[PDB]
Design a protein around this ligand. Structure first.
Ligand SMILES: NC(=O)c1ccc[n+]([C@@H]2O[C@H](COP(=O)([O-])OP(=O)(O)OC[C@@H]3O[C@@H](n4cnc5c(N)ncnc54)[C@H](O)[C@@H]3O)[C@@H](O)[C@H]2O)c1
Ligand SMILES: NC(=O)c1ccc[n+]([C@@H]2O[C@H](COP(=O)([O-])OP(=O)(O)OC[C@H]3O[C@@H](n4cnc5c(N)ncnc54)[C@H](O)[C@@H]3O)[C@@H](O)[C@H]2O)c1
Ligand SMILES: NC(=O)c1ccc[n+]([C@@H]2O[C@H](COP(=O)([O-])OP(=O)(O)OC[C@H]3O[C@@H](n4cnc5c(N)ncnc54)[C@H](O)[C@@H]3O)[C@@H](O)[C@H]2O)c1
Ligand SMILES: NC(=O)c1ccc[n+]([C@@H]2O[C@H](COP(=O)([O-])OP(=O)(O)OC[C@H]3O[C@@H](n4cnc5c(N)ncnc54)[C@H](O)[C@@H]3O)[C@@H](O)[C@H]2O)c1
Ligand SMILES: Oc1cc(Cl)ccc1Oc1ccc(Cl)cc1
Ligand SMILES: Oc1cc(Cl)ccc1Oc1ccc(Cl)cc1
Ligand SMILES: Oc1cc(Cl)ccc1Oc1ccc(Cl)cc1
Ligand SMILES: Oc1cc(Cl)ccc1Oc1ccc(Cl)cc1
Lengths: 274, 274, 274, 274
């Protein structure tokens, strides 16, 4: 496979539906040696089996808000794996209230929480593991259109993702000198533990399905394969990029109508509402 | 005014609803000395009165597909005005068929026409008048979101506008050395002779009205004022820019819902649709 | 003038070279009634005379890190001015260390400071004064190309500005319903108290001067005029926009060479370098 | 392999250094069945042996300026291959003069040639072969940063590439309904027959090498692998995207300096310039 002999750290798995899992799964089918981290002991209940399923005995605790965990992590992968060829950063969080209502109502606390867990953790994760990164290593994080466009009540996470993509660009210049790559995979809406916690997500999901050029929502496998590519040597010439895996949704300047042209009607007015 | 003493050429007026007219109107209110061009004698019937209305006796014939017209134009403005401080390029065309159906169906002839009238003409207009341009001169052209985003059946005009905005960047580097500025005003949908010729434009218009942040379509005056700004010394520090005057529509990543949050419903499903 | 009768709050004046002063100066020349805020008593020494210079007796204390100041600000402008037509948000801070070295070295504390002072403050400032904002009101903030592109050691401030422009988009949708506008002016490098504190800024400045299409650095007046425009009714059709006032620098995909074409040489290898 | 059993048409091979060959090579290593086209009999001298090297006996003549060639192409692939899974569009042309001097000097003829051969050909190629495209088929074309940013004397080809990326977006919507994907690979500068014909290309090449984050130019293999990915089911969730394979160069907002920070000096002033 394209990751045969390669060692990578997967941060962000919560269950078999996690985007991090889709990527880990695809990276595994490519021969990668994987190691996983979990936020707490409850999540570990799902991460461990998943790890074993992917031939991995390396499971470490990691709550990006606890700096001491980063210390242990360094020592852990350095002892178990010795070095890393790729890092998957699939983590983000903001209080439930922040994701509803307007950005205006956001509290200073919710803001900092969103930024620290969703943005700064990439810096700390990368800086902490930099010594263990081999040449050609690849760092991947996840983003969403909400960083550069308005998306229904994405609010503060929108500011976080925009900062995150900027961080991807600066990190690429900081680590590129060492031949290390950094990119962001901008996935289209998909059902996950975090997404199921978002208001009217079924609607955001329905909207993408109908208005996206490929007229369908992206699968966990498609996001996973896209991540695996970004992480492999297949994309050794790619860095600082925000790669879209959203069935082409990002290209839409408005609602689709294309199929019907009698008087041209919104695909939305025809399907998933009437 | 901000254009007092300044001399500009207005290319693109077809009637009192033309964007070029809005711009000319706003520039006039700022003390600008104006000159106008018309495609043919039928359009001249509307351009002349408008020109007189704006205290202008300089009306020249100009069909961008006829190179000889550019020769006469140079001689005309050089004799009547001696020099130009700003140029407004508000012209575009493509066969009716091209704007309906898909891009795939576009013929080679419709493609070339769209590109020559909507893009090359800016090059030839600018190159032809370059010797008559004073320092600080400002060249302005019009574009639409369809250049960088998909908009319903905009098809070939989308490729043209994209090229046009790229031309704006190259022309800014070419003329910037001579202290001349070049920009593109990306207007939101608005009723005009050319727009009225487009299929289901009422819908594209309705859609922008409901989904745009300011919840309304832009007025001709707002587009005009924006243009005047771009043309005046007020923006002497701006060049190679694509300025959006679309009630903020360009920031939308999807349909609006913001106002209603019970279950959060698409503002489209509530207004202009039910 | 275009701001005659209009009332604006200027946040960010440190001295006669602050971008906020340029904007205030330009807005003043347009008949605007102004009110200013200062971070502390040392800054107030410069803010007051400036305020008087601009015919303003409304000077308030405002350190965006102290929530109680926002309460007093509300009560103050509400008592002195009654309502606001525009808000100028020209504030940003980050520890000196963050702006040097790599992003990777940034501490969690510096990160939060950068984000809170430079981004969250726009949210709190706007939310606090929302009730005093009249219809058609305009909120303006300042950004830099470092948000979407890598700029020498801009680091964390780059992430901040990316988030800021994203905030401008979400705030525009939140406030657009109330006919209020929100934009960001992306100014080119310019000598200010804050800029003078940045390493090798003379170089970033020199580089923009030689490589920018208009071959020069932007003047405080140009930035001020651009701001005034964004804040006036002249731009009532503009919102959620990131307006570039950088002598067109943003369009450069590489170093300039355009003038000399023998073998084509980098303008940088010819000027300010030999 | 990821293209095992998949059938694709490679358009644009001139020799063993052509980007189309790098992609064909990578697609071949993935089990794809290939078919090639050549402009004329002189090019065929290089295409055939290459085709045989890639286990391909399907070599067809195709000059995108001759419509009748598209007719023959349809009949040829339909008889030899029956159907297509992916199309590679790696073709562009502009008179030598256009690529030097300014855009302002471009003639109407050079403009049309640049647009027709570099942009319209994708439309015609795709429309002609649409009936032979299986579901999940992928259409790939090549672009360059010069489409959205100014690149030294890229001129009219910059307008063309901008239009080409816009076309990719519209074609993605037109063909997405049929589950077909359309993308654009934006390669970094690389030595090819066409590039060798461009003025001071060694400099543009040198400039990317030193200023790109990965501090190196991209290899033909890297571009090939990126293309193969875009053409394979690995990217089934990607469409209408402009994928950058330029060692991360696109993220640079100015010349690099990062490594040296004493006073921070442009890497350009240190290497390939002294
Ligand atoms: N070389 C680079 O650094 C670079 C960078 C970005 C994009 N590209 C793009 O890659 C594509 C081609 O790649 P390349 O650099 O390998 O060029 P190349 O010289 O290897 O071949 C591309 C050419 O297109 C073909 N062509 C020209 N006119 C044609 C016509 N009328 N009909 C059919 N074919 C025609 C030529 O035969 C030749 O194969 C172009 O779109 C080019 O703009 C190249
Ligand atoms: N689901 C989508 O449609 C979608 C779309 C775009 C982007 N994303 C991004 O993908 C990533 C999440 O993936 P997902 O959607 O599979 O959701 P998920 O729930 O599976 O993943 C979120 C992960 O973040 C972890 N996390 C939360 N707080 C943490 C903390 N303090 N320390 C360490 N880990 C913490 C959770 O434990 C969980 O494993 C996020 O970055 C998200 O923004 C998701
Ligand atoms: N109406 C909108 O919602 C909208 C939105 C975005 C951009 N635009 C742009 O604005 C410009 C047109 O403004 P408008 O909407 O007022 O349309 P309009 O009909 O009022 O103006 C179009 C002008 O172009 C002229 N023209 C066409 N072919 C010509 C030729 N061969 N030679 C000389 N002139 C020629 C017409 O005579 C007409 O005066 C176009 O470039 C268009 O793409 C319009
Ligand atoms: N100078 C440039 O070349 C340049 C370029 C692009 C953008 N900008 C932006 O312009 C804005 C400021 O303009 P400037 O460059 O003239 O800087 P400036 O020094 O004149 O203003 C910065 C202001 O921020 C204020 N500030 C800092 N911390 C504060 C706090 N906690 N509470 C309240 N106020 C606080 C300072 O008091 C000062 O008035 C910044 O947002 C900056 O990022 C500057
Ligand atoms: O970024 C996302 C974008 C989408 Cl469309 C769906 C889910 C996402 O992921 C998260 C992660 C944590 C929190 Cl609190 C909220 C959303
Ligand atoms: O560019 C435009 C965008 C919009 Cl929304 C509405 C009208 C426009 O202008 C034209 C000009 C000529 C032709 Cl043939 C078609 C459209
Ligand atoms: O954003 C900026 C961009 C440039 Cl080019 C120059 C100065 C800027 O403003 C600041 C404000 C506060 C800190 Cl701590 C650092 C920089
Ligand atoms: O697009 C390109 C970009 C670069 Cl950097 C180098 C070569 C390129 O390809 C071409 C193809 C045909 C002509 Cl006439 C000119 C350039």
């Amino acid at each position: 496979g394209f990751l045969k002999g390669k060692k990578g750290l997967i941060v962000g798995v919560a269950n078999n539906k996690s985007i991090a899992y889709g990527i880990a799964q695809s990276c595994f089918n490519q021969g990668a040696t994987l190691a996983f981290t979990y936020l707490n002991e409850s999540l570990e209940k799902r991460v461990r089996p998943i790890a074993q399923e992917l031939n991995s005995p390396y499971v470490y605790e990691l709550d990006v808000s606890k700096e001491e965990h980063f210390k242990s992590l360094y020592n852990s992968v350095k002892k178990d794996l010795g070095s890393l060829d790729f890092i998957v950063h699939s983590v983000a969080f903001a209080p439930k209230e922040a994701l509803e209502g307007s950005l205006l109502e956001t509290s200073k606390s919710a803001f900092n929480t969103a930024m620290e867990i969703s943005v700064y953790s990439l810096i700390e994760l990368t800086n902490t593991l930099k010594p263990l990164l081999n040449n050609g290593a690849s760092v991947l994080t996840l983003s969403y259109l909400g960083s550069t466009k308005y998306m229904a009540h994405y609010n503060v996470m929108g500011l976080a993702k925009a900062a995150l993509e900027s961080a991807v660009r600066y990190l690429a210049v900081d680590l590129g000198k060492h031949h290390i790559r950094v990119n962001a995979l901008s996935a289209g809406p998909i059902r996950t533990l975090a997404s199921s916690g978002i208001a009217d997500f079924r609607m955001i999901l329905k909207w993408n399905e109908i208005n996206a050029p490929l007229r369908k929502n992206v699968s966990l496998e498609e996001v996973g394969n896209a991540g695996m590519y970004l992480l492999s040597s297949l994309s050794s010439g790619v860095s600082g990029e925000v790669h879209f895996v959203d069935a082409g949704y990002h290209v839409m300047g408005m609602g689709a109508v294309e199929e019907k042209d009698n008087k041209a009607t919104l695909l939305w007015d025809l399907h998933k509402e009437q």
